[PDB]
Design a protein around this ligand. Sequence first.
Ligand SMILES: NCc1ccc(Cl)cc1CNC(=O)N[C@@H](Cc1ccccc1)c1nc(-c2ccc3c(N)n[nH]c3c2)c(Cl)[nH]1
Length: 238
Amino acid sequence: IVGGTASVRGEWPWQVTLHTTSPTQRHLCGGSIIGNQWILTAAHCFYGVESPKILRVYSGILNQSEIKEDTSFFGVQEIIIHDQYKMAESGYDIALLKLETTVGYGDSQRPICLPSKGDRNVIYTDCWVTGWGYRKLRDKIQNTLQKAKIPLVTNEECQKRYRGHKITHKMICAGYREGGKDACKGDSGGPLSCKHNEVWHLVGITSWGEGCAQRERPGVYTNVVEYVDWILEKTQAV
Ligand SMILES: NCc1ccc(Cl)cc1CNC(=O)N[C@@H](Cc1ccccc1)c1nc(-c2ccc3c(N)n[nH]c3c2)c(Cl)[nH]1
């Protein structure tokens, strides 16, 4: 996160750190708890990932330093990538992780509500992007979970900012015209959480952008409301 601040413990209890153990254990992507066996993240995170056996999900983490060999985690039973997904810039940048065991809910880990079908017409004015990603273009993964409030941008306005790309309604953008606050390297897969009627909703999935927090370059997010049926299809399968 560029231009953000340290989060308070328990502030984003749906935020997870997805680690890889191949070749060395390290943070790979952000993610969100949406169910007691389900993590919602970005499909691009799994480029070259041949097995879910190399993945570890850590919930209830403020600081990456809390993760040691003895730290409990959730194994991944299955990686579910949207089957229309080709690349982040083309959309369908969404994936589900089916966990091997059940997340016990508490004040350190709980699910975030998915947007409602009716909420496609609602205007969110209180949106936050969270993660352990870089604070600048050339940096390292941050110890403490960072947060930054970002305004949503219309599709039309986002499309003017990305000449040469096709910004679909399955994408949602967020950023300041002058830049300064955004997601950066290591934040992808994480949430864009918006508070409306005292309830947090998973409005976006950190997907892609041209650089980090650049002037007239909004962050591009998977528009979660456009995938609620896909999420229900994969999580509510008979
Ligand atoms: N252009 C930035 C931008 C701006 C606004 C918005 Cl909304 C989205 C984005 C996108 N921001 C991303 O996170 N992009 C992902 C893409 C990607 C995901 C997974 C694997 C490969 C590529 C990314 N993650 C890392 C990364 C991961 C882990 C570590 C680590 N342990 N050390 N260093 C790291 C660095 C890099 Cl580099 N790039």
